[PDB]
Nanobody, 120 residues
Framework: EVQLQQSGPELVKPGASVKMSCKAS????????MHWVKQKPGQGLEWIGY????????KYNEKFKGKATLTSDKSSSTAYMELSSLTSEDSAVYYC?????????????WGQGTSVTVSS
C-alpha cells in the first residue's frame, strides 16, 4: 500500500543546485516524518535530516545544514530536498525514508533513490 516515489537521476556541473522529490502514497502524509539519507558506494548510509509535514518542523545532521534544504507539500503528499553548490563529494544516491514513529530514527519505508552525479 505504502510507496515513496522519487524523482529521476540528475547529471550536473559543479556549483549547480538540484531539487529532488519524494511523492508518498498509501498512508496519511502528515502522520509520519520524512527522512533523507545519503549513500556513496564507498560508505554506509548517512542521515541528512528529516521534515515533519504536520508542522514543517525540520531537524538536520549538523554537516548538512546550509547544504541540504528540506521542504514538504501536504496537498501533494510530496517531500523535497534541495542540495546547493554541488561538488564531487555530493555524488551519491539519495533516498527518502518514512520515519517509523515510534521509534527513533528507524525507517520502515524507502524510496527507490535518486542518483545525483556531478561531472566533470
Amino acid at each position: 500500500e505504502v510507496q515513496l516515489q522519487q524523482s529521476g537521476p540528475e547529471l550536473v556541473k559543479p556549483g549547480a543546485s538540484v531539487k529532488m522529490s519524494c511523492k508518498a502514497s498509501g498512508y496519511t502524509f502528515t502522520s509520519y516524518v520524512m527522512h533523507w539519507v545519503k549513500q556513496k558506494p564507498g560508505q554506509g548510509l548517512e542521515w541528512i535530516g528529516y521534515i515533519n509535514p504536520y508542522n514543517d518542523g525540520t531537524k538536520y545532521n549538523e554537516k548538512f545544514k546550509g547544504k541540504a534544504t528540506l521542504t514538504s507539500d501536504k496537498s501533494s503528499s510530496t517531500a523535497y530536498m534541495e542540495l546547493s553548490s554541488l561538488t564531487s563529494e555530493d555524488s551519491a544516491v539519495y533516498y527518502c525514508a518514512r520515519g517509523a514513529y515510534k521509534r527513533g530514527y528507524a525507517m520502515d519505508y524507502w524510496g527507490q533513490g535518486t542518483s545525483v552525479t556531478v561531472s566533470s
